[PDB]
Amino acid sequence: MNGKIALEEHFATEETLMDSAGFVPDKDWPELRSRLLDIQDRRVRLMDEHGIETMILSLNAPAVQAIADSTRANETARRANDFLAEQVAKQPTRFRGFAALPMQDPELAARELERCVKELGFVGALVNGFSQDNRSAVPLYYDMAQYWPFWETVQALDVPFYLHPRNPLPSDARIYDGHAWLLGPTWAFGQETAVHALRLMGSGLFDKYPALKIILGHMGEGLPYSMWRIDHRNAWIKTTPKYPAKRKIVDYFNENFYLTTSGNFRTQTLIDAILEIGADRILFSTDWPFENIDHAADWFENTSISEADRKKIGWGNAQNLFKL
Amino acid sequence: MNGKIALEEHFATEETLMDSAGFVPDKDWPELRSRLLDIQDRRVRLMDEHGIETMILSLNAPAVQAIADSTRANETARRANDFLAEQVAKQPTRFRGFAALPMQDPELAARELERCVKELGFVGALVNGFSQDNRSAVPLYYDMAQYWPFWETVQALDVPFYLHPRNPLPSDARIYDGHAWLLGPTWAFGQETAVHALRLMGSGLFDKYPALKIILGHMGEGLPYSMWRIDHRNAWIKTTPKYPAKRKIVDYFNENFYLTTSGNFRTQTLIDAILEIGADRILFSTDWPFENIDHAADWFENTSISEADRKKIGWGNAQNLFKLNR
Amino acid sequence: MNGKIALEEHFATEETLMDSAGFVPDKDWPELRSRLLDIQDRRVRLMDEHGIETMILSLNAPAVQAIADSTRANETARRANDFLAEQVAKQPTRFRGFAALPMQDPELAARELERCVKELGFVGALVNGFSQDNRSAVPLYYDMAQYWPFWETVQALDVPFYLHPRNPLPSDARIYDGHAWLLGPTWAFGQETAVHALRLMGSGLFDKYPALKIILGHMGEGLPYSMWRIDHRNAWIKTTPKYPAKRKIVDYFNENFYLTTSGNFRTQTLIDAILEIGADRILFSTDWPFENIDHAADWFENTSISEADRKKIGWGNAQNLFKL
Amino acid sequence: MNGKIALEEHFATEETLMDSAGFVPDKDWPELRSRLLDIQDRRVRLMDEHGIETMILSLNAPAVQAIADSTRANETARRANDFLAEQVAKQPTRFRGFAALPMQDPELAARELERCVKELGFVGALVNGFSQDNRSAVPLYYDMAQYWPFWETVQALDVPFYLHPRNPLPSDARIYDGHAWLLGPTWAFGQETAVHALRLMGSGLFDKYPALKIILGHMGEGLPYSMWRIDHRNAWIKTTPKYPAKRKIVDYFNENFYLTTSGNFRTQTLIDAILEIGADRILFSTDWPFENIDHAADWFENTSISEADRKKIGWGNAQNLFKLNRAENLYF
Ligand SMILES: [Cl-]
């Protein structure tokens, strides 16, 4: 299938490159590093070879979310975005950009998102989970009141926010002590991102801003499988849920979320996602260069869904979402 | 469908009762309290009305896992087991017991499991996640080396170990700060239990003791949906996984684990579990009294699976697993 | 779920009433007969109680298709259609009509479809499989060349054609001799209708008129389950299929067909249809009065699909299809 | 996955070879002919290359079912069965046999099945739909009363009966006239076989012999998708079904039938069958030489099911069904 749109497709700048070093064995780092820095050449050949018309590009991880000085975070985000705009402009029919944002300061993040969308033609934002900030004794999650004016801005711009993983901070990760193999994509990323996403939903953010669109990778970080249980556990109790939001969590999941297939090339899981959220809210993605383009495309080509849905997931849904 | 076997079915003693307080709103505590304390009477009428032949009973939560003096944990486990055995004996065709165990101390736990299996006729153990023990600065997880001789006894006895949830300790729960709605069955129970189970799998425990049987409630706490990703993430990398176990995580999930339907009455979730672990390793359970028997039974009666698999999940699998036809 | 649209919903006129007698046991005939005749009263109360906003009504079976004199068939069709228009006009927000057509004569059927659509505001046609005609020694199936100008007319009007069952003729039903329990909805209706549809697909009709929309009840009469096998059996043989159509049978199935849930209230069956043709092509229907509205609605309310797709199958798909 | 058991795997003798002609284009006949006649050599190499330990072999189609003189049918069945026994004995760890049977004559069919099971060590029978017999004005279907003593014998022997397709007779095939492309595996085989199987269930045969085991290829010829509808259509009517059987059709489908994956290598269809009849009653098979071994094995290797069910469908179910891990098959 030609014409696919892929939207969790990463690069690094020299400035952020080393953030990705921890995530593969030392012998595989030169390969991963070269993939991260390459945008124009091998990446596009592989797109050609595997039926991808367009990659929506985003910076690597944790990148800006780990830059604890908010002034420095803004400066880095702005440099990464200008670079990305220049890269996109070289092959404008094959690429779009997601913004890197300095979420350390809601106001700076809002301004940078406006610049990115209206000046640079970017089609959304991608943010690696909570932010570290020297002014805050705690990690910053985006359900917090200070972020409401930022979300108002997102909704006004009508572009999606892709909530990407990062690892929990060490003091929030003791369950994984002595078990580092569970950190990262194996498991810890999924738990961190699912809970951050649930925090947004429980906060009532989508009551106030009901047109917001949040994207999750990895087929939604386990959420569809346990979604029924999230609202319906202990159903014999008749009570008002103890979160600020007005409706059930699944209503927000159904109305405000999109899932991508990145790094989760499993037909059973896709079928479960289809039967919980619908093929209209599922988008093809690879997670290149952390996952191979060939693996992602070959799996997707042959997965056990209708051809009508393969088209929607392949490109139709993304076409509509990003007004492409 | 009559003849069902259910095996995540809880009671409290007056001693452990307060552990369940504040899992429900105040207005509902009189009802939960009465359910937890009733074994002989209304519980059996509900079983009769909803086609459950046998409930395998277990103490509530965290119960023994929160008794930080190991000597007292053992004393409590022993009293609760003796009580359970007495209650089982009043209606022996309708009940079996799971052991409560003082996991604070591996030798005490192994000895108590032996007594429960050999002297009391118990058919497995149920433990509410990690243990607190005054002697340990850190919570105790059962992948730790000190537990290996205990697991040797589990395998020798050839009875399953049900790994039930508890909440993370507050200092390991900062992600939920300001969001207490996420603690308990909503989410936190699932994460804590999935990770504890994965820690057992990655530790190599099942290489050393391959015949062990571990049971998880709640359709495996999310595990089936993300199981492919656990082993296969970043597949382009050819490397040996950085855990001590010798095989893939999914090999031990497939070979050593069973899932029950407790508190997760969702047909899509069941189908996904069937397509990942197979109907032979899925067991009906309810999580009474925290979930209604009528809700669990009515959902299961009509869920979209073959009748052959309805019989296996309803009773066939448990009959084989627990040797009840034997 | 309020606002459902249901589109295999039957009535009889006194003229066609007895065609339905003997589909149910004698003790049940008085009930069925009263249901068939009632359009305005109990039927609407039941729609209210079971969340159906609109029923697209069609005549019973075999009706016009068993009237062998083509002139008589056209007279009966006109009366039934005029009656239906008068009935729809009494409660115009709750009903629409499908045309009955004298398929015995392709020109008369085209003209009657035109009159029904243009003058009566009907939104499609419903036909009970093959037609009997005195002038023809064989039953008339609609893939035959004489039907092509009719199909040109259907396409130009841009309204769907609902291919409903009837039983095979006795000389074409010997396999059921001594086994009358297999006739009708049990099995024979499904075989008869699947093959009629497949004849349409293989004939090349949809090469010539690619915008045609055909609707099948009963979740597609077994088609999705065996659809892969229809094209891909004996795949090691590299050859051109021996039918006149230019593409695979499944291409026409995917592009030209819709399925309804009528009389097949089975979640496993619906999931298989979703994974083969996609939820965009599946439509809620009951087969009232042959099946109960309460059974149909209760099953569909709780079936194991996404809320997005429940809305699409419930009403969204029909709204789009019929331009309501 | 090595170790698979496949049980819809065909051969021809020179006697029955021409029955398979005109199933494929002329250009492909030399290949199909060579596959049908080869049992010992390339067939085993392809089994080795695609992870099949055992093929349970059966004659091609319609073969015995089209021999209308019952005396001649019995003669052909005997010769075909002796040939198969001799062939199996050459490589007894890789092959088992299904009986070809002269179903024209209930008595002859029962005696030949006895001979095949007791003397030749065959593990079931495979019959290609209805029989033509000169004495009968109508095609012979196995729900008919005269077959009940034959089925008593099947149950007593406790071996399965694989009901394979054949086309309807032309006079029963007018719906396909001018549409020959629908004949055969495309569609007509499936309709024919589904109905024949339904006639057995409706007849009450399984009330009388409840231990019978019937096998269907092609994932059960459409039956699972439409099984709910078979019993439950028009449910508001409270009535006794108008067939002689005492129970619901689905009760017999669930209790007396097995389905194989032959010629239906479709994951959506497998999942549907799993959720209707259960993986315990599904068996890997290929339909070699009419389907490729490699296509069947490659699809099954990667289909979206549990590893536990992949072992059951791949070999476990068949190993148990045909008692292949048992003394009479291993040592005698
Ligand atoms: Cl009829």
Report d(CA A282, CA B269) in Å as an integer.
Answer: 18
> DSSP class of residue A316?
I
C111 Cα distance to chain centroid: 20
- In the structure encoding, which two tokens stand for residue C142, read together? 């609609």
Residue found under tokens 């050449």: A41
Interface test with A, best of B181, B196, B275, B304 (most A CBs within 10 A): B181
The distance in angstroms from the start CA to the end CA of chain C is 18
Distance of CA D13 to the CA centre of its chain: 19
Contact D51, D297 (CB under 8 A): yes
Exposure letters B237-254 (e unless 16+ CB within 10 A, then b): beeeeebebeeebbbbbb
CA-based nearest distance C303→chain B, Å: 9
C109 token code pair: 């059927």
Confirm whether residue A164 is marked as ligand binding: yes
Identify any residues that bridge with C55 across adjacent strands, giving them in sequence order. C6, C95
Helix segments in chain D, DSSP class H? 29-37, 42-49, 70-90, 106-118, 148-157, 188-202, 205-208, 223-232, 249-256, 267-276, 293-302, 307-311, 317-321, 327-330
> Half-sphere exposure of residue B159, counting CA atoms within 13 Å on the CB side?
23
State the DSSP code for D265. Answer: -
Q: Hey, is the C-beta of D305 within 8 angstroms of any chain B C-beta?
A: yes
Helical (H) or strand (E) element with C318: helix C317-321
Q: Which CATH architecture has domain D2-332?
A: Alpha-Beta Barrel (3.20)
Structure tokens at D273: 């069958």
Residue C120 forms contact with A (CB below 8 Å)? no
- Chains touching chain C, criterion 3+ CB pairs below 8 Å: A, B, D
Do the beta carbons of residue A274 and residue A308 sit within 8 Å?
no
Contact B98, B123 (CB under 8 A): yes
**Separation of D62 CA from ligand 1 center, angstroms?**
32
Sign of the torsion formed by the C-alpha atoms of B66, B71, B74 and B78: negative
Question: Within an 8 Å CB–CB cutoff, is residue C305 touching chain D?
Answer: no
Indicate the residue type of C203. Answer: S
Amino acid at A287: D
- Cβ contacts of residue B12 below 8 Å, gap of 6+? B19, B20, B36, B37, B59, B60, B63
d(CA D317, CA B278): 14
Tell me how far apart the alpha carbons of residues C126 and D232 are, in angstroms, rounded to a whole number: 24
Closest CA relative to residue C220, chosen from C188, C261, C256, C183 = C261
Q: How far is CA A259 from the centre of its chain?
A: 9
Ligand 1: centre distance to CA B31 (Å): 58
Determine contact: C320 vs chain A, CB below 8 A. no
Beta-ladder partners of D126? D162
Residue whose tokens read 């709204």:
C319
Compute how many other C-beta atoms are within 10 angstroms of the C-beta atom of residue C92: 9
Name the closest residue on chain C to residue A278, using Cα atoms.
C306
By CB neighbour count within 10 A (0-12 exposed, 13-18 middle, 19+ buried), where does B312 fall?
buried
Distance of CA A34 to the CA centre of its chain: 22
What's the gap in Å between C220 CA and the centre of ligand 1? 18
For residue C94, what is the DSSP state? T
Write down the domain spans for chain B. 2-326
Residues 6 or more apart in contact with residue D181 via CB below 8 angstroms = C202, C241, C242, C243
Six-digit token string for D61: 């189609």
The structure tokens listed for D46 are: 């392809």
* Shortest Cα distance, chain C CAs vs residue B229, angstroms: 23
Cβ within 8 Å of residue C69, ≥6 positions away: C134
- Cα–Cα distance for residue pair B305/C217, rounded to 1 Å: 24
Q: Which token pair is B54?
A: 């046998």
* Residue located via tokens 């029919």: A93
Q: Scanning the structure block, which residue is given the tokens 């699976």?
A: B305
What one-character-per-residue DSSP string does C202-244 give? HTTHHHHSTT--EEESGGGTTHHHHHHHHHHTTTTS----SSS
Beta strands in B175-284 (DSSP E): 214-216, 257-260, 282-283
The verdict on whether residue A232 carries a ligand-binding annotation is no
Q: CATH top-level class for A2-324?
A: alpha beta
Instruction: Verify whether the Cβ–Cβ distance D267 to A271 is below 8 Å.
Output: no
CA C268 to chain centre: 22
Q: Which CATH superfamily is domain B2-326 in?
A: Metal-dependent hydrolases (3.20.20.140)
CA distances to A45, A49, A318 from A53, in Å: 11, 10, 12
DSSP-based helix, strand, coil % in chain D, nearest 5 = 50, 10, 35
Cβ-contact A257, A220 below 8 angstroms: yes
Resolution to 1 decimal, in Å? 1.9
One-character DSSP codes across B6-68: EEEEEE--TTTGGGGTTSS-GGGHHHHHHHHH-SSSHHHHHHHHTTEEEEEEEE-SSGGGG--
Are A80 and A122 in contact by the 8 Å Cβ rule? The answer is no
Q: How far is D142 from chain A (nearest CA, A)?
A: 37
- Both tokens assigned to D88: 């199996």
Residue with tokens 């498991």: A187
Phi (first) and psi of residue B78, to 5 degrees:
-60, -45
List the catalytic residues of C. Answer: 287
C-alpha D86/C-alpha D81 separation (Å) is: 9
Structure tokens at D332: 């005698």
C-alpha of residue C166 to centroid of ligand 1, in Å: 4
Q: How was this structure determined?
A: X-ray
Chain C hits for B271, Cβ within 8 Å: 271, 304
